[PDB]
Amino acid sequence: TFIRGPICGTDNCPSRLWRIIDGRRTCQYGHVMKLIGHEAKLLFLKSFQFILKRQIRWLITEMRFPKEFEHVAKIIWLKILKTINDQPQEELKLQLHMTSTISILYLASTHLSLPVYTCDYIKWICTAKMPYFQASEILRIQLPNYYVSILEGSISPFNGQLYNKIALTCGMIHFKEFFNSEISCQGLLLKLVMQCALPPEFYFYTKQVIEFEETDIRNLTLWERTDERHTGRVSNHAELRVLSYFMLTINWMLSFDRDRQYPLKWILSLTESLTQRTTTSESIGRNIVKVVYPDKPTSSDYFQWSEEETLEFLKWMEKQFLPTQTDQKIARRKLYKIFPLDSTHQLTFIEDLQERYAKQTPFFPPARKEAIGRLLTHIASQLLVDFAISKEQLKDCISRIKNACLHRMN
Amino acid sequence: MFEVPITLTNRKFAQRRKLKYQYINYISRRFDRISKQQKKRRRERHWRSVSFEIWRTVSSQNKQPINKQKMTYHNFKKIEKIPLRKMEIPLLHCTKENKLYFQSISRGLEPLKTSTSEVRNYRTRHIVTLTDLLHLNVSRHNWSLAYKIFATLIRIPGVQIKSLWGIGVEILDNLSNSSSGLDFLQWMCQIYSSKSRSIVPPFQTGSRTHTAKFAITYLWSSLINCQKSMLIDKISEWVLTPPFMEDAEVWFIYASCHLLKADINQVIKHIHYVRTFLKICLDKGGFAVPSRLIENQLKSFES
Amino acid sequence: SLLIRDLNDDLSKLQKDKVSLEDRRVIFSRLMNAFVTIQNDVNAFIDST
Ligand SMILES: [Zn+2]
């Protein structure tokens, strides 16, 4: 017979009061009246490696990758794991930022010649589909705050941090003999023509300028481990040069159709079919990336979006910002439970692509340079948000490689 | 380009606040000389003020009789010369960008880039867009959508928001579902009236001395929910309930409940009642009709 | 009780050495009111009768 309370009114207990209905109250003898230190390298690399295999799970599963990728990842993460555990110091000196996760994913994908490119990764992670923006997301482990900072920090890929970290890894363990670091070029061309509404001739145009300056040899290292660089090496991440050739091609090609194959108008109609904000999975995505792109204008771009864009936005917020990070509690379960928590419309990708291909289907004088310019600058915008680089970065590259074509042409 | 409803991303802004208020201390200290630790920052930021119904201000009378120039070039650079080197010491500890900011604000130049404009996180940026769409939809009369925004928002763990007037007028104009503006307000007072800075001007406040906007507005607006009638002894029952004595505005709410209930000796007691609370409302910072007008309605009653 | 302690407070903030007579009638009116109702509440207790 228990209630614990009221100890015992006898100073050789206090032993433990139950009340009988008769009010004696009776006591038993029988009166009736934290985190690791300095080798959490091991835990660090475990949350990191665990987060990696988690992401692989999401891309074979949800992206229908091949199972071979995983082995290619154990090999690359194995090489650099072996290289950081061929390093002595108790001072950690490692940077396993998230850019390293994405860095070995892209590295492995590129060995395997899969037609995935950096912009696929940027989209995937900025749309909260592929889990990224957290340490062991809200649900795990308590580590030294020095390493939680080594994770949460350097999170952004958005100034070319991804290209720089994939080249950095490409030094950390060598691309050349160990792997095949040729990019999947021609699928990028397809991705690009379809990404505009360019007629399929430009695939072969740009493919040809490509062959003209390179003869199609494309590497992955830009490495001489440092920070320091100041010439020759704004433009040797293959992709960025591909986009540069693409832009150039459009400019040259269209401004020297002495044939007049490409109407003064169809460049405008192309610009407008490219400009018309319409709600497909893709453009909705590019809006989602526009939101976390560092520079204006792209945030003024979210300004010029429309009620349905904002709505599908809050949708993606309640879906993929459940991937958040980090008495009164039940008072907030009832408090929030005070207000209720609670023929397919928009079209697919090739549907939109088809319909603007038709919106220009009427195919069959110095201010047309204007049309060339505004088209080039819109295309540029899309590339800047999609491939997470800078205005100034891009134009540095296409400037350099444009002089790199004039030099091998003159 | 609009205010964000999140606590500002931290480190550099705080250590800049350090450099700023520390140098401020050294200059103003030597200035009073010539006129003769989190806590150091705390005292430092501390000793400083922290025909229609216009809640009028305090106009100009009973104030000083000027000053004549204190500060020539030579005299100012006298005051400035030494505290700038003292600053040279911990400037060596802060970051290069922070040091540059110290150099420029101390020249008097004002920084190009906002705290937001240089801020740098997924979940919080998403909450920013969520809350934004809430405020936008509530402005757009889109009470349905806005309601979806609100429910999805309050679901989130991430930030508490003072944003409360946003939700007061929000659920107010919403009418849609969720335990409404009054419920929110009385919640605000029940949670934040007991021991149980940057962000805070007056339109969101703490219950030591006046929590103003939301309280007085649910008060009056509830008396207008009696304008729906001709509920009152309810509104002044829970205006009777709270102790937060620096109001008087709830004294005029009270006396207004008695004038509204006075529209037989019972009606007499209500008129003597309003007569009382108008003076115990002369208790504090006055809400005044000529009030002989109030009494003139009370004589139209005395009929 | 509190209410009468207030009537008594405003009552002293007469001179009315200046001060115009009639308020004399209204102050009395308020005082009669107070006395009557306290006397009623006492009666009711000894007495609800
Ligand atoms: Zn005992």
Q: Which residues surround ligand 1, an ion (CB under 5 A)?
A: A 8, 10, 13, 15, 27, 31
> With an 8 Å Cβ cutoff, is C40 touching chain B?
no
Method of determination is cryo-EM
Chain-chain contact of C3 with B279 (C-beta, under 8 angstroms): no
The residue of chain C nearest to residue B265, with distances taken between CA atoms, is C33
d(CA B216, CA C26): 32
Written as one letter, the residue type at B176 is S
d(CA B286, CA A359): 69
Chain-chain contact of B279 with C6 (C-beta, under 8 angstroms): yes
Beta bridge partners of A183: none
Chain A environment of B4 (Cβ under 8 Å): none
> With an 8 Å Cβ cutoff, is B158 touching chain A?
yes
> With an 8 Å Cβ cutoff, is A314 touching chain B?
yes
Query: Distance from A267 to chain B by nearest Cα, in Å?
Result: 34
DSSP type of residue A192: H
Enumerate neighbours of A (3 or more CB pairs within 8 A). B
d(CA B21, CA B28): 10
Name the residue among B129, B142, B145 with its Cβ closest to that of A317: B129
Name the residue among B272, B279, B280 with its Cβ closest to that of C33: B272
Written as one letter, the residue type at B228 is K
d(CA B148, CA B137): 10
d(CA A205, CA A196): 15
**Bond from prior residue into A297 cis (ω within 30 degrees of 0):** yes
List, as ranges, residues 236-255 from B with C-beta within 8 Å of C: none
> What separation in Å is there between the alpha carbon of A172 and the centre of ligand 1?
73
d(CA B73, CA A37): 56
Name the residue among A302, A324, A335 with its Cβ closest to that of B123: A324
d(CA A215, CA A212): 6
Could you tell me the resolution of this structure in angstroms?
A: 7.7
DSSP for chain B, written as a single string? ----SSPPP-THHHHHHHHHHHHHHHHHHHHHHHH--HHHHHHHHHSS-----------S-S----------HHHHHHHHHTHHHHHHHHHTTS-HHHHHHHHHHHHT---SS-TGGG---HHHHHHHHHHHHHHHHHHTT-HHHHHHHHHHHHH--S-----HHHHHHHHHHH-SSSS-HHHHHHHHHHHSSS----S--SSS--BTB---HHHHHHHHHHHHHHHTT--HHHHHHHTTS----S-SHHHHHHHHHHHHHT--HHHHHHHHHHHHHHHSSTTSS-----SHHHHHHHHHHH-
Query: Distance from B107 to chain A by nearest Cα, in Å?
Result: 28
Query: Distance from B285 to chain C by nearest Cα, in Å?
Result: 18
Chain C environment of B275 (Cβ under 8 Å): 30
> What separation in Å is there between the alpha carbon of A6 and the centre of ligand 1?
11
Q: Which of A42, A128, A212 is nearest to B121 (CA)?
A: A128
Query: Distance from B295 to chain C by nearest Cα, in Å?
Result: 13
DSSP type of residue A218: -
Chain-chain contact of B178 with A338 (C-beta, under 8 angstroms): yes
Assign A199 to helix, strand or coil. Answer: coil
Burial of B25 (0-12, 13-18, 19+ CB in 10 A): middle
Report CA-CA distances (Å) from A249 to A80, A214, A238, A243. 39, 14, 16, 10
